[PDB]
């Protein structure tokens, strides 16, 4: 069970995205090669105090 986040600030926050650098970490190779790369989890900030 997960809770959908809410925007609390004017600025946008960090998000995980596919870019030209990491494009081919998420698709197979010509001979079927596959990999799964590590992804971060706590991208958005929250105020401690």
């Amino acid at each position, epitope marked *: 069970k997960a809770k959908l986040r809410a925007s609390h600030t004017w600025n946008p926050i960090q998000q995980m995205s596919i*870019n*030209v*650098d990491n*494009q*081919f970490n998420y698709v197979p190779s*010509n001979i079927g090669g596959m990999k799964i790369v590590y992804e971060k989890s706590q991208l958005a900030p929250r105020k401690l105090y």
Partner: antibody
Amino acid sequence: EVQLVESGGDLVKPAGSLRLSCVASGFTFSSYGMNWVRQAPGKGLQWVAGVNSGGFTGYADAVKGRFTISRDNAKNTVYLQMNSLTAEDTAVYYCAKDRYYCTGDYCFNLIAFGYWGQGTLVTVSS
Amino acid sequence: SVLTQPTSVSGSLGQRVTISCSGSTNNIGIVGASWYQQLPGKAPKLLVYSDGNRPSGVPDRFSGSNSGNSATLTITGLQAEDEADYYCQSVDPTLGVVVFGGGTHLTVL
């Protein structure tokens, strides 16, 4: 306008190693490949290595087993790592940009350097 | 794979100059040559693309063509600005190796 600046030249022993760096600006760095072309004193241009957006690299047969090239698109920088240098490697190395937009594994089918840097000198001797 | 160029070519002011680069079906027969200009001690400059186009600001004096395994660069209305060294560049698609020519020195009379 597109501008490139190199660095890293030095004098090393006949069996040492060295690393060079270029800094680029003025264009979509991730869309175009960057290449290392060298010129021995009094001789013609010679290609060394090239790297594309996703980290894919190509090396000439003269350096394929020794050298290594890399990028950092977040810093618009390209590096070349040379190992097991020999005297013949002595040359001024030029950093250039491709005219054509290629990103992934299937580049090096059409290359044309359209902008150039200033060059850095590599000397291999005792 | 390596490309072949003549060591030097000579022409007089106002005439036409031709520089020839020879390759193979593997390099020039698929991707035509691209021509570069190098003043003594300076960084090279691109003159004519593989398709005959020129970078912005290059005079129409410079032109190129491809036939079979050989390419040529034609300089028309030779001026004093053209005394330099010229190179042909092509890429081998079979091997993925970029090939330059040996270079040719241009003498203006």
